[PDB]
Amino acid sequence: KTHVQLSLPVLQVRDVLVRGFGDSVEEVLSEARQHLKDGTCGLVEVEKGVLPQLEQPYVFIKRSDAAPHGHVMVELVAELEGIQYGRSGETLGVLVPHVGEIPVAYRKVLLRK
């Protein structure tokens, strides 16, 4: 299917145990898309101070559409050393591995694969 429906845990920065998906722009996006599938993506909402506390490269989800059945459509946009690779809407969050952290909310997104 071109877009999957998911809802990801919103995890507070300081709890996140694995703080970025890898060490290139191709592999933070490979794992993002590979963790969205296996069920293990959570979400940190970028607020002042969050990004320095996470590792680059950063996978944001951002909105690609001005809400099927509740879920915001969104796409991934790596960033590393200021350059973004992709082009999308507003950031609904940064994407981390979820590995037992206890969420503070969920965020119904629909991810273009």
Curated annotation (Swiss-Prot):
<comment type="function">
    <text>Inhibits host translation by associating with the open head conformation of the 40S subunit. The C-terminus binds to and obstructs ribosomal mRNA entry tunnel. Thereby inhibits antiviral response triggered by innate immunity or interferons. The nsp1-40S ribosome complex further induces an endonucleolytic cleavage near the 5'UTR of host mRNAs, targeting them for degradation. This inhibits the integrated stress response (ISR) in the infected cell by preventing EIF2S1/eIF2-alpha phosphorylation upstream of stress granule formation and depletes host G3BP1.</text>
</comment>
<feature type="region of interest" description="Disordered">
    <location>
        <begin position="1"/>
        <end position="113"/>
    </location>
</feature>
<protein>
    <recommendedName>
        <fullName>Host translation inhibitor nsp1</fullName>
    </recommendedName>
</protein>
<feature type="domain" description="CoV Nsp1 globular">
    <location>
        <begin position="2"/>
        <end position="113"/>
    </location>
</feature>
